[PDB]
């Protein structure tokens, strides 16, 4: 289940569908081909409060949402994708949204096949009053689909590599994602795996830290009983809220700025540096932008 | 049934394993019973167990495990089987604690026999298909009454009009495995790992 | 009543009888002396694969789990009071009815103080109609209680400073920066004094504004004659009689 | 006669249980001696270092 | 700045907070609420994980006390008079006076709350309890249903009686079976002795 | 070289302490098992007789 | 010493590889075997043991025949000749085992 | 010369440890023989009587 998630075989109506992945074989209905897909979720801020589950379901060329709630509310919800942007609406859940009840969402539309790979399908802009709405949580959803034989071959590759090297399925997935979009295994990926093992043995680092050292991004996948590396760095414990990469906006790391930002403070605390050292790191890495942002 | 079982239990407590085996073979023997120079066709040598004869019609009038097993003498079959497994595991541990090569081989033999009598242990089946309900949804008197009416009708008849029960209307809890048997399997796994 | 009790007992016996034979752990050299009953087949054909959905002990789905115990407790104690009474379970705790019986709820560790704080916060914001942040801002200036005013950012700053440098040794050894601080501000560092508590402590009291100050500093249901009883003062300020 | 038989049976069972507890205390003493021997075997390695 | 694990701008901001009695003199200079929040975030950014957890525990305890006092002073339920933290405990079925160190789970705390409520209702401590409801089989067997362990034992006895079968004792054992047990209750049992 | 041998000597002392603790723990489990069992079935039978 | 350690590691790896190859490519006349444990019960010798435990050929043959006899007597392997399983040697199996 | 005497002293300590281990091993053998023998023929005869 670490590799495959939960197979869709007609369970009960709610039952969730993520362990924290979902997959099944589905015969495409526009022609006579049988494919297999897989959707992986990274939970997004304020998900453990409200939302029993928030699942992205795939039906062959179009996707919808299945949602359950912790608390009862008498109003509706809008599933957005942007930070309350004009073009952020991608679907709606019609209420009243009672707790512990399944709710389907109307064949989400405003999302492209390009962003369906590493694209946030989620924004639970749920209405608590007639004019008050809040972000009640969600997750970033990544979708892959292959013919069944190609899926089996890729699973063969991944399982053999994980078994022989000792890396976790999610660690290998992050390594291959930080190397190419197609998630193929080549000399570059094998070299990164070697350097991961070597750095872990040499500097007495965890596999996540060695993976970051090798050139990969910080891992955000959680295993439904553990904490992701990003969350362990930046949200254990949270300052007062959750800092997430699902922000995409510009924060100024100029030390000389009056009225600093919560994002800057959380980044400083996660990296274990002060404002001047964070400015030094920004200059050294060259991630700096205009206005020292 | 009750006298050979008590004699077996006392001999096992005193560690007279061969005599205990002789006394428990009057009730159950995995190798059968020799009657008139041939293997008998019955599995259990205790006739009331072989025929599952209930002789207690009011078992729940008091908290009494023996009364329950008298109402359903299947539990007596399970109890005798578990007593036999306990005897085998005690024999294996007693052989193991001698540390000689022949003693270790004897321990391996006893553990393998216990494993072959137990079989292959099952997995968790219904946990991930369970839809977690609300507290009020689980305590729903309507759900409880529907299940109880189905049970009452099943206790006499078997009418299954609209056979499938429309799984979406389940807020009931699921049966649980036996911790004693899982403990047997865990012990055997640990002992075989250490021996190997 | 007696027939209802006997039927309940019979159904319990039948369910146990079915599950005993359906158990996969007896599959099994003991399975040779096991027979499938017609009632077992009927139960299977009615309820699907329920009879074979055995779960491992420690799962929330089990019938002997804490979820099952809580279901029984709630089912029987739901009606211990009339829905009119304020002591009704669903009147004093409306979240119990909507509590979800899931494995994460059964296993995940959390602090009793966190749960109690979220319950109290829910009740307070239900009463006031505002947000948690609005409640905190209001508490920062609320005076008509003994544990208030509660300036949460101020207390966080004070605790951070006390963690980093207790006894103010670093500040004492650097007189250039210690001289720029006011005495009352340093008192706020050394002891819990919010800006509003400082205003309370340093506001001047005259006979003209005595009544307005009393109305501002005390609840509406408190009159200056309430200070003629020492037991009331002890109860209000949370002191013992000797302390008063 | 029933009372006398009960008294004899009780005496027999009491003596048997006394013997059992005495064997348990002997087992504890045996374990203590074995632990002492092992501890001395380790002290020997310390002393030769 | 190094001692407080922060920067001289933050130190200057902390120093600029002056208590000057807010009149009776020129004036006092205090930050706004949002400026206080920004200063708190900046100051808390310098702590490690352990110190952050300790600070969170202290904040939880202080908020518990403040919220309990606010509730006691401002909210009175329908027909319930509650005058203390212990009254709040017995009303909301959760202890607000516990430390931040002790932990639990949601289901365990719900179980404890309902157990406390049932005890208070049955022992006539809370008025108007429905006496007809208090005579059910659950509350009649409340001597074993008041704890999860005893409830689980009496519930499992129906489904796995073989775990509690004892070959040497049983309700309804005959006198001759007792005599046989006494006859073989020694420690050195031979085959001839058992026969 | 001599100082390295001294380090080895303190390691051997740690090993001796490990054996001592193993013996003490065995005693603890033995006496806890005696205490929890209390009056066994034979002694109870004799008293009832 | 290092050569002996290398030989032990090689023996363990070869045992696993050969067992997997046998399972995936060879099936006997009418026996369905699906595991290393099935291979153990069939070939009457443990392939899951370590290289540390040692034995002799006669001792291993004795253990294998004892395992086979236990499996045949307890009706675990089907089609066992019940007339043969009533001899004196197997009637006294409580002391001959 | 003095350092040679120190070496002789630690040898004497090794000999003391040897005597201590001899006593411990004697105790272990005695208690093992008592434990394995358990209930002897005289006690068994008395209980049967």
XYZ file of C-alpha atoms in Angstrom, chain B residues 27-170:
144
model
C -10.904 -36.616 23.773
C -8.978 -35.389 20.731
C -6.120 -36.796 18.681
C -4.906 -35.165 15.441
C -3.737 -38.600 14.235
C -7.064 -40.400 14.682
C -8.007 -43.354 16.850
C -7.280 -47.048 16.313
C -10.510 -49.052 16.575
C -10.457 -52.750 15.612
C -6.979 -52.354 14.158
C -7.943 -49.560 11.752
C -8.278 -45.784 11.780
C -11.719 -44.766 12.994
C -13.806 -42.450 10.780
C -14.601 -39.870 13.477
C -12.475 -36.806 14.186
C -13.334 -36.203 17.857
C -13.366 -39.153 20.239
C -15.831 -37.379 22.543
C -19.249 -38.180 21.079
C -21.068 -35.033 22.309
C -18.362 -32.897 20.698
C -18.403 -34.946 17.488
C -22.164 -34.396 17.252
C -22.245 -30.872 18.791
C -24.972 -31.668 21.317
C -26.174 -28.592 23.187
C -27.260 -29.298 26.760
C -27.850 -25.822 28.202
C -30.776 -23.745 26.970
C -30.262 -20.719 29.271
C -26.561 -19.823 29.157
C -26.807 -16.034 29.558
C -28.853 -16.076 32.775
C -25.492 -15.590 34.522
C -21.918 -14.712 33.577
C -20.627 -18.252 33.080
C -18.178 -19.302 30.339
C -18.756 -23.000 30.982
C -22.511 -22.470 30.653
C -21.909 -20.706 27.336
C -19.724 -23.567 26.114
C -22.424 -26.011 27.233
C -24.968 -24.137 25.135
C -22.520 -24.257 22.194
C -20.111 -27.209 22.569
C -18.047 -25.846 19.682
C -16.183 -23.732 22.225
C -15.219 -26.998 23.903
C -13.598 -28.096 20.636
C -11.675 -24.823 20.500
C -10.664 -25.102 24.169
C -9.343 -28.644 23.715
C -7.420 -27.601 20.602
C -5.842 -24.666 22.440
C -4.905 -26.922 25.368
C -3.149 -29.245 22.922
C -1.282 -26.299 21.371
C -0.247 -25.119 24.846
C 1.138 -28.578 25.581
C 3.155 -28.562 22.354
C 4.591 -25.105 23.048
C 5.549 -26.089 26.600
C 7.299 -29.190 25.257
C 9.186 -27.066 22.744
C 10.304 -24.506 25.325
C 11.417 -27.247 27.719
C 13.496 -28.786 24.931
C 14.891 -25.370 23.965
C 16.131 -24.530 27.457
C 18.597 -27.462 27.415
C 20.859 -25.839 24.770
C 22.203 -29.114 23.365
C 22.093 -29.673 19.605
C 19.657 -32.575 19.954
C 17.589 -30.435 22.324
C 17.464 -27.624 19.758
C 16.424 -30.076 17.044
C 13.661 -31.411 19.302
C 12.530 -27.842 19.996
C 12.404 -27.133 16.266
C 10.360 -30.303 15.778
C 7.813 -29.303 18.427
C 7.499 -25.762 17.060
C 7.062 -27.028 13.495
C 4.368 -29.451 14.656
C 2.551 -26.627 16.452
C 2.742 -24.448 13.335
C 1.457 -27.239 11.090
C -1.468 -27.842 13.445
C -2.295 -24.124 13.605
C -2.064 -23.411 9.884
C -1.389 -20.055 8.267
C -2.527 -17.029 10.230
C -5.034 -14.679 8.568
C -4.811 -10.998 7.738
C -6.973 -8.055 8.745
C -9.868 -7.999 6.277
C -12.598 -5.574 7.305
C -10.636 -2.703 8.829
C -10.033 -0.611 5.710
C -13.515 -1.172 4.271
C -15.136 0.171 7.459
C -16.795 3.559 7.040
C -16.294 5.499 10.257
C -19.673 6.802 11.483
C -20.619 9.547 13.878
C -21.220 8.705 17.519
C -24.947 9.371 17.132
C -24.978 7.465 13.845
C -23.466 4.432 15.554
C -25.771 4.728 18.583
C -28.790 5.063 16.264
C -31.696 3.059 17.647
C -32.989 2.693 14.081
C -29.815 0.901 12.966
C -29.808 -1.248 16.096
C -33.467 -2.216 15.633
C -32.949 -3.035 11.953
C -30.049 -5.355 12.774
C -31.969 -6.947 15.656
C -35.028 -7.548 13.468
C -32.847 -9.189 10.825
C -31.315 -11.407 13.522
C -34.733 -12.296 14.965
C -36.075 -13.281 11.551
C -32.896 -15.262 10.861
C -33.268 -17.144 14.145
C -36.347 -18.916 12.771
C -36.616 -18.523 9.004
C -34.116 -17.168 6.521
C -36.232 -14.939 4.304
C -33.793 -12.944 2.173
C -36.117 -10.818 0.074
C -33.710 -8.308 -1.479
C -30.861 -10.563 -0.411
C -27.987 -8.078 -0.372
C -28.302 -5.769 2.626
C -27.230 -2.604 0.747
C -23.865 -2.200 2.470
C -24.202 1.604 2.610
C -26.694 1.127 5.483
C -24.114 -0.446 7.822
